[PDB]
Amino acid sequence: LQYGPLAFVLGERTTRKLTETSKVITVDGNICSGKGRLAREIAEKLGLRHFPEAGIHYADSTTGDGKPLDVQLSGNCSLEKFYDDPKSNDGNSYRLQSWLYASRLLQYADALEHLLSTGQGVVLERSIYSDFVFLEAMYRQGFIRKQCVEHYNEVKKVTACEYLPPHVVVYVDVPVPEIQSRIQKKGNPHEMKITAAYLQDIENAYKKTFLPEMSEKCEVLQYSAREAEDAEKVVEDIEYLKCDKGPWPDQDDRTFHRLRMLVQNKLEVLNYTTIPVYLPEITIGAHQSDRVFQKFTELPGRKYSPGYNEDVGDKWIWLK
Amino acid sequence: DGPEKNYEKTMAILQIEAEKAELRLKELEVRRLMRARGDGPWYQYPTIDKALIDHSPKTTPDN
Amino acid sequence: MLKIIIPTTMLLPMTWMSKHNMIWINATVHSLLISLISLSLLNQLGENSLNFSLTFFSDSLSAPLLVLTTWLLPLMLMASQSHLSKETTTRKKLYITMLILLQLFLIMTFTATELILFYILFEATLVPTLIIITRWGNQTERLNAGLYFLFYTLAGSLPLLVALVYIQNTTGSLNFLIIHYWSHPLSNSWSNIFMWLACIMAFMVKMPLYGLHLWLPKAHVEAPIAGSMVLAAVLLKLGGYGMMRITTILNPLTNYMAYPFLMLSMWGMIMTSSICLRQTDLKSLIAYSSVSHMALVIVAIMIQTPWSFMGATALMIAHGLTSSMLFCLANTNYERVHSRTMILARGLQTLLPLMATWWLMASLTNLALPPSINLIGELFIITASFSWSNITIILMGMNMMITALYSLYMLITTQRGKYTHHINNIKASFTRENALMALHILPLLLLTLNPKMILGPLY
Amino acid sequence: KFYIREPPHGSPDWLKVGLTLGTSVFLWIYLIKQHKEDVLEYKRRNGLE
Amino acid sequence: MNPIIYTTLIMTVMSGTMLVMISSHWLLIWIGFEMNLLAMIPVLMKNFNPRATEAATKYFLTQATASMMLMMAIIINLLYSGQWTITKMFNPVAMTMMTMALAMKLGLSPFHFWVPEVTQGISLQAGLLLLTWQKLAPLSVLCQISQSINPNLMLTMAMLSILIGGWGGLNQTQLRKIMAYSSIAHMGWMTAVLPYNTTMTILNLLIYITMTLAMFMLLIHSSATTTLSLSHTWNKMPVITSLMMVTLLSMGGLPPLSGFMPKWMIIQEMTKNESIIMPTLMAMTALLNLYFYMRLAYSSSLTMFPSTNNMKMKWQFEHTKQMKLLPTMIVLSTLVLPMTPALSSLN
Amino acid sequence: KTLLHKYSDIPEGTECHRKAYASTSIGGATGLIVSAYSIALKPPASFLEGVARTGRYTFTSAAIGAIFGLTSCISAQVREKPDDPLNYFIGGCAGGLTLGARTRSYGIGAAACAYMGLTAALVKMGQLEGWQVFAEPKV
Amino acid sequence: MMSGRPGRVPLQFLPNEARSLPPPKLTDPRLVYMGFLGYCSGLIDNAIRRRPVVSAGLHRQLLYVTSFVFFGYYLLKRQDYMYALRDHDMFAYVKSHPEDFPEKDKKTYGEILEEFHPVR
Amino acid sequence: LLDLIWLETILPKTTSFIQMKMSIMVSNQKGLIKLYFLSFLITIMISMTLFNYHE
Amino acid sequence: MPLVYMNIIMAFAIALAGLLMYRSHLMSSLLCLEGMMLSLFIMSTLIILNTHFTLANMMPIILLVFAACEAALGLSLLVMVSNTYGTDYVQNLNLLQC
Numbered sequence A: 001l002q003y004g005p006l007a008f009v010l011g012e013r014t015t016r017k018l019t020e021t022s023k024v025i026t027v028d029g030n031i032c033s034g035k036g037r038l039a040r041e042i043a044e045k046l047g048l049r050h051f052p053e054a055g056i057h058y059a060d061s062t063t064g065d066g067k068p069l070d071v072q073l074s075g076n077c078s079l080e081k082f083y084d085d086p087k088s089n090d091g092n093s094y095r096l097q098s099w100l101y102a103s104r105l106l107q108y109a110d111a112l113e114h115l116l117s118t119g120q121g122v123v124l125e126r127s128i129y130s131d132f133v134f135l136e137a138m139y140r141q142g143f144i145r146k147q148c149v150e151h152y153n154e155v156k157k158v159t160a161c162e163y164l165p166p167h168v169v170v171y172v173d174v175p176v177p178e179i180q181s182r183i184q185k186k187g188n189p190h191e192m193k194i195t196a197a198y199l200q201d202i203e204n205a206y207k208k209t210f211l212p213e214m215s216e217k218c219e220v221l222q223y224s225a226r227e228a229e230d231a232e233k234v235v236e237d238i239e240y241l242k243c244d245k246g247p248w249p250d251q252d253d254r255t256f257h258r259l260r261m262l263v264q265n266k267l268e269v270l271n272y273t274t275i276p277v278y279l280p281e282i283t284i285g286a287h288q289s290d291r292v293f294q295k296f297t298e299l300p301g302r303k304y305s306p307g308y309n310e311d312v313g314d315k316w317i318w319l320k
Numbered sequence B: 001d002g003p004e005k006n007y008e009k010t011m012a013i014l015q016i017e018a019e020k021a022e023l024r025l026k027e028l029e030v031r032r033l034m035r036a037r038g039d040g041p042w043y044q045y046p047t048i049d050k051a052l053i054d055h056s057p058k059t060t061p062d063n
Numbered sequence C: 001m002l003k004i005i006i007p008t009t010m011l012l013p014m015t016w017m018s019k020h021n022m023i024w025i026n027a028t029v030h031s032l033l034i035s036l037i038s039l040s041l042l043n044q045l046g047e048n049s050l051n052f053s054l055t056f057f058s059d060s061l062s063a064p065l066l067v068l069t070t071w072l073l074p075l076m077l078m079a080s081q082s083h084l085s086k087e088t089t090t091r092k093k094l095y096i097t098m099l100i101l102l103q104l105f106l107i108m109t110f111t112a113t114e115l116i117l118f119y120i121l122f123e124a125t126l127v128p129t130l131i132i133i134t135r136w137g138n139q140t141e142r143l144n145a146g147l148y149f150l151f152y153t154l155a156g157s158l159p160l161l162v163a164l165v166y167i168q169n170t171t172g173s174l175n176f177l178i179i180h181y182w183s184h185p186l187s188n189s190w191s192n193i194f195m196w197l198a199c200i201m202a203f204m205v206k207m208p209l210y211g212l213h214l215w216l217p218k219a220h221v222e223a224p225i226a227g228s229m230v231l232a233a234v235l236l237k238l239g240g241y242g243m244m245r246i247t248t249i250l251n252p253l254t255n256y257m258a259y260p261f262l263m264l265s266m267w268g269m270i271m272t273s274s275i276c277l278r279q280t281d282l283k284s285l286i287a288y289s290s291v292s293h294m295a296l297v298i299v300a301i302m303i304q305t306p307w308s309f310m311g312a313t314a315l316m317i318a319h320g321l322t323s324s325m326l327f328c329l330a331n332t333n334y335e336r337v338h339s340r341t342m343i344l345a346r347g348l349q350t351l352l353p354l355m356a357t358w359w360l361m362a363s364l365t366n367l368a369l370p371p372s373i374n375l376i377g378e379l380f381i382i383t384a385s386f387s388w389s390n391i392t393i394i395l396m397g398m399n400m401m402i403t404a405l406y407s408l409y410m411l412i413t414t415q416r417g418k419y420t421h422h423i424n425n426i427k428a429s430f431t432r433e434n435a436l437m438a439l440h441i442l443p444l445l446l447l448t449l450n451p452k453m454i455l456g457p458l459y
Numbered sequence D: 001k002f003y004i005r006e007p008p009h010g011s012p013d014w015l016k017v018g019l020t021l022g023t024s025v026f027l028w029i030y031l032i033k034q035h036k037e038d039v040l041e042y043k044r045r046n047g048l049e
Numbered sequence E: 001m002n003p004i005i006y007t008t009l010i011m012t013v014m015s016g017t018m019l020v021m022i023s024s025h026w027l028l029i030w031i032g033f034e035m036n037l038l039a040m041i042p043v044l045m046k047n048f049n050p051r052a053t054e055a056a057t058k059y060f061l062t063q064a065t066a067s068m069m070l071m072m073a074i075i076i077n078l079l080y081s082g083q084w085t086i087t088k089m090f091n092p093v094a095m096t097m098m099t100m101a102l103a104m105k106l107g108l109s110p111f112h113f114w115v116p117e118v119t120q121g122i123s124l125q126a127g128l129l130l131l132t133w134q135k136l137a138p139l140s141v142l143c144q145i146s147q148s149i150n151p152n153l154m155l156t157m158a159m160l161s162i163l164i165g166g167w168g169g170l171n172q173t174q175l176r177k178i179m180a181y182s183s184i185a186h187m188g189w190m191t192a193v194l195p196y197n198t199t200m201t202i203l204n205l206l207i208y209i210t211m212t213l214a215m216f217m218l219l220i221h222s223s224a225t226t227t228l229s230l231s232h233t234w235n236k237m238p239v240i241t242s243l244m245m246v247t248l249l250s251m252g253g254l255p256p257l258s259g260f261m262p263k264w265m266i267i268q269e270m271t272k273n274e275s276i277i278m279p280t281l282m283a284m285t286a287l288l289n290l291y292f293y294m295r296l297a298y299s300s301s302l303t304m305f306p307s308t309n310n311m312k313m314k315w316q317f318e319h320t321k322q323m324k325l326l327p328t329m330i331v332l333s334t335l336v337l338p339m340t341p342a343l344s345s346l347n
Numbered sequence F: 001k002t003l004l005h006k007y008s009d010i011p012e013g014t015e016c017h018r019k020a021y022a023s024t025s026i027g028g029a030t031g032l033i034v035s036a037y038s039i040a041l042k043p044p045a046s047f048l049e050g051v052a053r054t055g056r057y058t059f060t061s062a063a064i065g066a067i068f069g070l071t072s073c074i075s076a077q078v079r080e081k082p083d084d085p086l087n088y089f090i091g092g093c094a095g096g097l098t099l100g101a102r103t104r105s106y107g108i109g110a111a112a113c114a115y116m117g118l119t120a121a122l123v124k125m126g127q128l129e130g131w132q133v134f135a136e137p138k139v
Numbered sequence G: 001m002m003s004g005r006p007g008r009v010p011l012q013f014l015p016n017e018a019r020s021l022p023p024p025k026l027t028d029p030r031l032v033y034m035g036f037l038g039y040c041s042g043l044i045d046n047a048i049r050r051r052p053v054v055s056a057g058l059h060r061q062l063l064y065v066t067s068f069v070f071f072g073y074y075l076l077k078r079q080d081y082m083y084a085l086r087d088h089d090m091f092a093y094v095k096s097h098p099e100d101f102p103e104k105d106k107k108t109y110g111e112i113l114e115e116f117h118p119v120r
Numbered sequence H: 001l002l003d004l005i006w007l008e009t010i011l012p013k014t015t016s017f018i019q020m021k022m023s024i025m026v027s028n029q030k031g032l033i034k035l036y037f038l039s040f041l042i043t044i045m046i047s048m049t050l051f052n053y054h055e
Numbered sequence I: 001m002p003l004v005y006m007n008i009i010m011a012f013a014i015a016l017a018g019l020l021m022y023r024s025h026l027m028s029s030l031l032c033l034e035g036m037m038l039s040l041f042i043m044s045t046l047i048i049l050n051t052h053f054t055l056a057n058m059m060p061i062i063l064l065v066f067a068a069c070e071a072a073l074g075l076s077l078l079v080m081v082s083n084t085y086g087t088d089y090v091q092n093l094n095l096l097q098c
């Protein structure tokens, strides 16, 4: 049985399974600052599992086969258009930011459910608390309007407060000109078309609000590029910090029940991601919404409830 | 079918519905009478049951 | 009547599970067999109403209207898949379901025996029509249309309900047969006057009477074509039918209070007709013409003369057919032009000769060219009114005159002229619409041949 | 197959299905038994047959 | 709230209502009222927002005033009669005081401003509970003592409830407020039919209970609280809005839907009691309720509204809350009209 | 109820002064009731403007009742038609226009004519017939 | 109307006496319609859960109709008993009060002076 | 003049405007507890003997 | 219908009037509520002591029993309005108006 009120009444707690090794970490940094590398290294050094950085189709990975659905069907926005044509009236950029926010929201939801259900710790590449660095860095670059920023802040406050901050977070400090050289050597033509001011603004927004406000919520671990190169030392650092900061200690089993209830209902998590605000890049029209929803319905495995679609290979539907 | 079909069917229907009509009128009149006087099986209202009363000799003689 | 009710109800599963392509074919054909079965119901005993059961009965007034509805049901199905082609299969199936539920409610209404059951289904016709008008409407004031239509109907419907339950308490039963056979004279009490008003004003709202007729130029003009024809053709006849049923227990009072409404229609049929002349939209012109014809039917009802009743019934049937055909023609032209002002596309008689004809005898029947059932139904009412009061004739004599004017005016200004050069989307006449106007027109002349059937119970 | 995770109801619960049919047949045969008892008891009540 | 604590509080609310509906002693009925009031406040305070505190307060002090008034009536009755049995009031002042003492609990008179406030402030589930379960007890007491009501006072109460509820519902876009006003209107209907035949009151109460249950659990399953949010449900989930509009047509009472059967039967009863102006008045003024019902239906299902792109993910994820008894509730909410005479089972 | 009964005791038409006084008192009573509700739900700002509000309401209502009474009695006496429902209808437009003339509005009192006069005709018809707005439980 | 009738025992569906009445037939149109409500409830239940509303969960729909019919039978028996009781109390009160139920000295239309209104 | 002006003003629009106007004065309460309970207070003696519901 | 009853009824009437009128605070209204309860207790006690309804003397005790419970719940409500509001006044309690 999935965890509900009846399980708490029966006696299914989560403080019992949760231990010191049950940690939720995000490894954050600049663009291609080795955050995925270091996240994987702390993952299998500390024995914790790893959810990769949520993107456009991470939610596509969560449901069904996991293949990345059509871009139009899965949020009608692409990172490549962001990199190539940044400023356009279609507003693909804020659609990208909002969809990435909601995807990282569900990534954190599943991550929290994991270590609150089985007790195994979780490691991540960025999260909600590091999600705002991008949006502010873009907005400072003449990228999006302040109405999009205010919609982002209003969605953040009403869809992030019900969650609680991570256990530890690792920062991999790599200088922005080194990041420019790294993207030079990367090769993908889209990330060539980047403003170095945007990269410096990502770095600034990281170590101006993210890390400071982090330090009052959990324990921060600032590592330079060379310092984060030797992963053994960073994992032995995260082992020995104190693990005694934030709302994590003062977290009773009843608030555990609340947060498990919240994470287990995905529609609740992203219920306020679709608040009626009528933003120029957010209102899909009645006709467009009708056609796109119909297209999603004709997509296999998305017409009936998961586990009932006969077209996909289900069975026993008539006594299910 | 023949006209006798409709004739006898209308006889039965008319008789049944006329019985329904004056039964409804009798229902209205009976309800009025029983609510006005109460000397009938329904429209009775609750009253205190006598078996609750205790008749044993109390402390005060002339209770 | 369950030989017509049960198949109509079972028609719902067929469409609701038919394939993505078979819904239209299946609904059309099986509705055609339903109309064929209801064609039997034209079998009428001399004077005794056919009493199938306690709750269902029919006579020479309900049967022609029932046949009209059942024969009509394929016609909306044929007129709808043009503007309903680009829709989801489930949505199309529900549109069909709304139409079947409408027809079912109309059948139970016309075959109802108790006045309360008649009221239940009579008003219950509102809901499917409301959905059809609101959701599938294409114009702006469709949302306003639904509010206007529902509230106008209900404002009369509820006092009728109060009057009916009061009658049930007093008389004993709302059964038509009882209230007619056990009818009692009505005293000229003012409480009885208000009871008559309650029993009359609902149907007169759905008649409509002049003044409180604003729901049609704001409802029929906006509804999808299927809704428009089912409204004008039959839903208008609901008030007339109900009045014909209810005037049995509404005498001799009626005459004294017949004076205000009668002339309200008599004068009103002029203004509406005049409003028809200075119109800009085809659908509004047809709606106002429908108001005028229904006002003539109102006059026929309140005369309470045998001849008036027969002419009334004939006019209801003929007007239903003619209004449905005229609305269908207007939809064809509008869809071909995607606009409804009757000046944008003129001189299409050459381009579409069969449409030119269909419009020609549609106007002729609307103009009441003898010996069509429209003309005989009109003339019977005219003679009854003249017997009741002579001066009526000039007002009557005015009406068709003005009617004739607009009865040809749109035909002059939509096909009898020069085509507009910048438009080119007028394609060859799809034989669907031509056939549809055929199924509209041939039954009209067929009933013209034998009008003893649509002549009503007084014949 | 399609869904990476097991479905909430994908393989139907033999338990709940079993109780569903078990109660339904109970309701049906209790209904029949009750109807027979009522008809016979009504027959013997007023002494019809 | 610990789930066991919530279960105990719900059981105490239900036990207070049961104590009201099973006790003969007046003091025991008041004790049931007190237990209901005592256990109701934490249920509202479950979500713990300032709206919840505001609403729970306004709920409390009104109910406390009503219950103290109910004691004044009970004590006067005992003084003038010497009986605690719930039969009838032997002092006209006591009953013409308890009529509004039992009215603020229902929230129908000008003692109704608390209802929209508490409904909006507290959560939707506790709103369902407040608008459905918290009305059986005072209505049960009114049904027991209906034999000795001053009809003028009760009818005036019912008329004011209907009129102000229907009018106030016309000017709110929040679903909780217009449901509170709809509940006020239905209170007016049942309370109007109360003095003549309490069986029709019970029938209307049952229909309203099931139909409000269906409406509210549809709202919860749609996770909507404002008109725009509910309108947005069409893109994510259309069957909810499709059932929404049918249930709203039942709210207005349009036959052949279930909602007509009370409105119908009530009209049939009081016209038997020579009351003709009153049924016509209510029948006409129910159109104010119907107007905002159709306004809600228009911008929920009959016209699809501008959606939000992130709903592409919302369609990707299904619901988890089961919403038990909902499909049955809709069925008794729309098609029970052909089984109308079954109301004799209540009698 | 006795205050309303004052109108009942005076036969319609005759004793026009007493009937006018009784109708004025009915109007004034309704006026202070409405003004009390107004200053309760809608907050005033001070004592003197509160008196202004309640005086405006009671002035409007007392004028309405007074002119209704006067029109009714003089119309029933002049035309010798006491049972005439239209006797109250002049009280409607009198009740209408001045009410608009109390609010300095034209359409207000124009529609008030028809509305108030029609309701006055029906209430008078309540005297003519045996209508009961609050019918005691009979069946 | 009957909540105060003598001999009533509270909180029990059928008060034993009702077995003397003909039980409602299993074919009864009211009963089968209440079974139809059971089918409908299954259709919404599958539709409400994004399921193949016609074919999904045959057992769930089958349970729905069976449950409705059972409560349908008992409600119909309860419904008919009250209406029978209404007639019983009616006629018994009619017989017990002959003076309040006068009989009418029957006469034909040939002697009734029914006024005729000329329809002009 | 008649249809779109006087016929709208005579029945539908007038009633709609009346309901619109006075539903506002009904539903614009400031929500304060003090005035709500003051209105309850006034209704108390208005029902008590001002209308003489007691007798 | 004797005299002391008049004084207790009149005291309850003024306490009902005082409850139904607020000035600033929440504690004062609660005190007026418990005064209403006091008047109820005194009245009922007088009634049952006078009538020698010996089995009914428990009724004022149960009255006080639920009296204290309501007072406690009301003042906890005031605790929460103070926690979220700093003070206890009612005119500033307006967040639910819209």
Ligand SMILES: Nc1nc2c(ncn2[C@@H]2O[C@H](COP(=O)(O)OP(=O)(O)OP(=O)(O)O)[C@@H](O)[C@H]2O)c(=O)[nH]1
Pocket: A029, A030, A031, A032, A033, A034, A035, A036, A037, A053, A079, A096, A097, A100, A101, A125, A126, A130, A131, A132, A134, A135
């Ligand atoms: N607009 C936007 N883009 C984001 C956000 N988070 C991540 N991305 C994009 O997702 C990708 C993240 O890449 P990074 O992890 O920074 O770098 P990388 O090249 O993958 O290399 P590693 O950091 O070593 O994993 C880039 O395309 C980012 O622009 C966000 O919050 N907003």
